[PDB]
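User: Assemble these into one structure.

Assistant: Restating your components, then the assembled model:
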Amino acid sequence: TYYPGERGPYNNNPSFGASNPSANFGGIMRALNSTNFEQGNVEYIQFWVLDPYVGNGESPATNAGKIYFNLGEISEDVLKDGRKQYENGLGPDQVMVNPQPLWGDVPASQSLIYAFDTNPDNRKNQDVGLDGLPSSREGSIYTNYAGEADPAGDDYTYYLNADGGVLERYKNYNGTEGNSAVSINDPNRGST
Amino acid sequence: TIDMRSAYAWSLASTPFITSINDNTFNANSNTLEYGFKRAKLSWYTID
Amino acid sequence: DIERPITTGVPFLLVAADARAAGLGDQGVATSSDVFSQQWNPAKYAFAEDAQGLSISYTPYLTDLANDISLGQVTYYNKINDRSAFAGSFRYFGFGGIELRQTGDPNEPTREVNPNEFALDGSYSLKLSETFSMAVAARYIRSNLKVATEEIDASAAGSFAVDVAGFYQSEEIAYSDFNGRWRAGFNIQNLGPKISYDHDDLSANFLPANLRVGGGFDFIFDDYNKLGVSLELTKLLVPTPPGPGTPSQSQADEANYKKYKDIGWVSGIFKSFGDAPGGFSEELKEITYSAAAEYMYQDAFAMRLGYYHESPMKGAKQFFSLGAGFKYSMIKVDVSYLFSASKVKNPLENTLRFSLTFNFGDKYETY
Amino acid sequence: SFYVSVKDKTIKLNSTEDVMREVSIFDISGKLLYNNKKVENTEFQVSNFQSGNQVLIVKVTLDNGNIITKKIVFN
């Protein structure tokens, strides 16, 4: 579900509502298990999609656009700064990159295992999203939205913890901040 | 076939180049916060 | 080959769950009363010779491929008077334990799943006359075959069904060369609401409502040699799905499927008789039949032969069955084997069924 | 000793020094979905659409000729 007129995560565009929604992008990426396409003889990308212009909840016919696919070597640096973010390395007692690297905090230590510990206090300090900031310090970086509750726009909401229809309930389900609550009985249940 | 529609396998993408490495359509070549200026909100999920 | 098979939920309910009936071509509606007489005809529990009995049955699947994939059955009956009996049975199909392992060290705590399907039923049989008996059975069916993943919910699907059965067993009748005995029975099975595997009313499957009718004769010579010949007819009480088309091109197919799937189970039972382009001669094509012969020696050794024929247009299950039975003191052992005669690979080929029954309590005289 | 793992619909055979010679993967219908006579203690990619089937049977023939059977869940 794509909202071209709404701000994506970590977007600090001062005039986002004044820009053409058609000029925006919304994108996801994944790694592939078997990387040698020639040896595997991968021939084509196949997909079945429901036509979004036909049935009950159809979009207006004037809402045309494009879906792009990329295959190959794609930058894993989601927040382009040359540094690998990993939030299990964040925390008040952790060493940070000495000048802050333009998207928020980055741990200065070499990562070892991509895993949290099970203490809720460390989890609260660590599960703060890809910007490395716990939404109270996001305004210093994401200045054009410092007045909002979530300046970086990366807050997670469980789909059973939200309101509205099904689409509105998944709107923030991909947020990277707060999506790893320690307890499965949390009202804002994790998703990872 | 190799299935690609596990929603948990997908994560937020880096900003893409559209036509060549010299195309700044979405500010992919930007070294500032402008790199993220054209990212609109996208949700990806399988309905529970 | 198989054209337009009947699609029902929980089809494991129709599998023969005991070696004695399996050896007789998957029929028991009009055989002699036995401990397994709940899947076939609960009404003959009132004709049991022993006061109570317990049985264990094992029907393995894919024996060459894996162990622990089987259909198991436990039956208990208890006839209290000379006219009435209570019976409870438990059929269980399972894949065995499967460990969900994703390497991640060889000491990880692994979840174990046990995909399974079971039906628990209890019946009460009452002898109305001295030769006729009736029974009612209530059954709880639970299907739990799917494994939980992300975006796959493995919640069990359940349903309830009732069975109405009747059994006729005449007294011994002397003939010129032998003193025979006649038997007859009917069983209307699995009458209940549709089972919703995905927990949605729009997507529900008919229970395998089934009608079994059969008759049997017992050739009795020398007062300790018996030759029991039995015949059984079976018809599914579920509407047949639409075939080529019976009102664009796929629009007709979708509309026909829509009108077929919007049929109640009660109305579907009556719509089973018909609902096909053919006439009565082609309506007989939905009938399965089985013929069986059982030779009894001293009532402690049995040899069983049976032929089962499903019309190859539906199901295409055709086979010959061999069975043997041994009674030591109070313990009966039954084994059965299947020789397939159809193109389609029978899952119970090359498989020996095993049944074990214990009879205890008082003994009731037969009329 | 011998353990089979499935991560992303990828099947991985792990044997403690037991060298395997052939792998066969069967559907619960007894259908052969995948046969490989060139096993390399490695990850097989079976076609991901199996018409709602989840349980597979993995049959592994060792060089000595013994057969190891494991039931897995294709997830």
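Chains A and C do not touch (no CB pair under 8 Å).
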